[PDB]
Amino acid sequence: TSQLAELVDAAAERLEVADPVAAFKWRAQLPIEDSGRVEQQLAKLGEDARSQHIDPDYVTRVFDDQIRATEAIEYSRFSDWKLNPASAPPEPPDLSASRSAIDSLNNRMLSQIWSHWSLLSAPSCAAQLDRAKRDIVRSRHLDSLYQRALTTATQSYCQALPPA
Amino acid sequence: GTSQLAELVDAAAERLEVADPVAAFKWRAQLPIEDSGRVEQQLAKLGEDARSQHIDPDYVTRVFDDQIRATEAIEYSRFSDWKLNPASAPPEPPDLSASRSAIDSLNNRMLSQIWSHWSLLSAPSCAAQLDRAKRDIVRSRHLDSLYQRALTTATQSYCQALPPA
Ligand SMILES: [Pb+2]
Ligand SMILES: [Pb+2]
Predict the structure, then answer these.
(1) What is the nearest CA distance from A38 to chain B, expressed in angstroms?
(2) What is the CATH number assigned to the segment(s) A1-164?
(3) Residues 6+ apart with CB under 8 A from B93
(4) Which class does domain B1-165 fall in?
(5) Chain B residues within an 8 Å CB radius of A83
């Protein structure tokens, strides 16, 4: 098992929430973009990082990637549902429920980042991440879109700097 | 041999291809893809255009509702792509004037073809001749899997229902 399996799995788990979020927005006719909200979600995460003495700029970069990957999945689903609306899940969970699940995933993600700091900042990170991704892509039989989204979500992981 | 519906299906496909410059503009301008009120205006004008040529406006409204949804679907797919890789979004894309003119011309080509092929669009042979036309235009325009799906959605109301006995 890759030593980055937990963090790449958490990334994938957070990507799973794009679908019910999209489903809800589709039915409610809400826009996918929410620049104000994203700006603020990243604010809290930055401050959480500072509290644990985790580099906030690294954290905000990673979560920005994560959020864009999620937005990409929502747009892809809207594309599919414009082509064939019958596919749109009729009774998705409330957006507030999805957002609370996301908040909890974020906390776990940040904890896994801190736990793996020495590895994320080590030269073996690129190799370990490619292995973690390859394993999870196969084991979850992730489709093309989710493979791409996972790449985007994890693209800044190995940018961590070792402690002073 | 060429489907009698190839000219119509080719216009539909060329009109779908306008999704690309339109999406690139909306992306840079930070505009959403959708606008229900805009689409209802566009559909209303198409109905008026149909009436002017004594084409069934309800039929034209259904066909163009499908065409517009299919176009939106392409626009959303590009937005997905550009969220994953923002550097791939076309930089400093041109404004929508060319796209506007193209859509006006293609709307007119489509409507005139619906009149020209009305008997076929109403006949049992429509389904197979639509299939033949789609195959021929997918090839001639080298349409990828996204545009193949979109062309299917755009043309799904072309063939009219037949008597049930
Ligand atoms: Pb580990
Ligand atoms: Pb899961």
Answers:
(1) 14
(2) 1.20.59.10
(3) B21, B24, B25, B27, B28
(4) mainly alpha
(5) 69-70, 73, 149-150, 152-153
